[PDB]
């Protein structure tokens, strides 16, 4: 047995809260675990309109990374959009991350940039069902914020999770600022000396979506990680739908990658 | 007793937010009822930060607004948890016609007679200075402490002690500070009378293992139309005894149709 430090980064609309099942599992197993709210997510005091810059969004993670004690390594886990966050963290603090885990996460690299993975990720999300956008940047300008609808969540995201967790999400999802492609590319810059030097595992966790799986496959091909693992039966929120499996997978990764 | 579709309105306590009711919400939406769970000021995903709302009417406003916008002839079952007892009390005075039955789940239940002054001072003593709860002095040492912050140990020992462990984790990630409202503010915001507040039906739900003597005391000074019990509940009944709460709420809905 070795005590580990897991660090959990959520996706669009979400927060630290979505990890509650895993947090509990990690804690009562005697491991250390931090689950962070990004900008204007969960109980982060910023509203979405106050963080138009991607660095503002990534800020809770960056400052936490900068705050980590000397001889300490972590297991950095990023879910879906959470992948961009943990990528930037790897480039900036490679000497603090024992291994980075991309749970069906956006995983850009030199051969497939952040601009690419984001336009594609946002295609499945924008316009789907009862989702909606705001126009505080002007009614003739590109949409400002994106808001997850209850029906979108139920049918596209939590479609394989318990009904209480849908309810939980419904009372907690917060709007996401629609960061400009240019801003995201300027922000998430990756080298092979740094980001490339961090051990990296991808977790394919999707079901009943061939197009999404292809996107995850394409990302693994253009930016090959050290390992690829898999969790079957998962909807778009694995920490809700397949939590025991995910915790096992995360403990397994942690122990062998020391 | 035939099933009639009803609308439940759920109101949380200090540090919490609509999220705490997640299990109740799912169970009602499954049964064919309407349910709305609300964030009060600077609770859950409400935009206001606690320091931005030193007046009680601002803590209460999301409920008061919801109540006002309710269509003409619709009545509701209104559930106040603990601190949420004051909010539903205020709502009972302003909009008595709109509430078929008010339900006080271990709630602060002052009457026209026992002032909201006394009730808060008692509620404060068991929270303030308890274990790892800490206060903050944003307006300096000259003035009263500004916010109250619930500590993870206080949560583990006095609030969540009988709840599944994952619910404790959920809470550590979501609890928010609460502005320490002055009892002079609450006194003047919560003005209760026997004509209005008194006209609304009231049920109190005791949580056995929640103070067992203070909750007992409020019933003497302000008698509800009934008392009910849920055994083995901690301070968050909706977390520890959700099904018992859910069925009790159904049962309650019916007797006071
Ligand atoms: C930019 C839109 C976010 C893309 C996603 O990855 C959707 C999700 O995680 O729910
Ligand atoms: C002064 C606020 C105390 C009210 C409470 O009793 C809050 C709780 O449920 O722990």
Automatic annotation (TrEMBL), chain B:
Biological process per Gene Ontology, one example term: jasmonic acid metabolic process
InterPro entries reported in the protein's UniProt record: AB_hydrolase_1, AB_hydrolase_fold, MES/HNL
Pfam families assigned: Abhydrolase_6
GO molecular function: methyl indole-3-acetate esterase activity; methyl jasmonate esterase activity; methyl salicylate esterase activity
Family matches, as Gene3D superfamilies: alpha/beta hydrolase
SUPFAM superfamilies linked: alpha/beta-Hydrolases
Signal sequence region: none
Limits of the AB hydrolase-1 domain: 8-245
Protein name: Methylketone synthase I
Natural source organism: Solanum habrochaites
């Amino acid at each position: 047995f070795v005590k580990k430090h897991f660090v959990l980064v959520h996706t669009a609309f979400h927060g630290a809260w979505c990890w509650y099942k895993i947090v509990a599992l990690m804690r009562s197993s005697g491991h250390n675990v931090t689950a962070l709210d990004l900008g204007a997510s969960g109980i982060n005091p910023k509203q979405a309109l106050q963080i138009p810059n991607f660095s503002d969004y990534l800020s809770p993670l960056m400052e936490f990374m900068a705050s980590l004690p000397a001889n300490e390594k972590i297991i950095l886990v990023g879910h879906a959009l959470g992948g961009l966050a943990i990528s930037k963290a790897m480039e900036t603090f490679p000497e603090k991350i024992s291994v980075a885990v991309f749970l069906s996460g956006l995983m850009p690299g030199p051969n497939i940039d952040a601009t690419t993975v984001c336009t594609k990720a946002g295609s499945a999300v924008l316009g789907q069902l009862d989702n909606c956008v705001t126009y505080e940047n002007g009614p003739t300008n590109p949409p400002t914020t994106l808001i997850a609808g209850p029906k979108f969540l139920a049918t596209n995201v939590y479609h394989l999770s318990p009904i209480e967790d849908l309810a939980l999400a419904t009372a907690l999802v917060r709007p996401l600022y629609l960061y400009l492609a240019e801003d995201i590319s300027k922000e998430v810059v990756l080298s092979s000396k740094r980001y490339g030097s961090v051990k990296r595992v991808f977790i394919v966790a999707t079901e009943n979506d061939a197009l999404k799986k292809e996107f995850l496959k394409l990302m693994i091909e253009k930016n090959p990680p050290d390992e690829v693992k898999e969790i079957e039966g998962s909807d778009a929120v694995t920490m809700m739908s397949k939590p025991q499996q995910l915790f096992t997978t995360l403990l397994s990764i942690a122990n062998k990658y020391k």
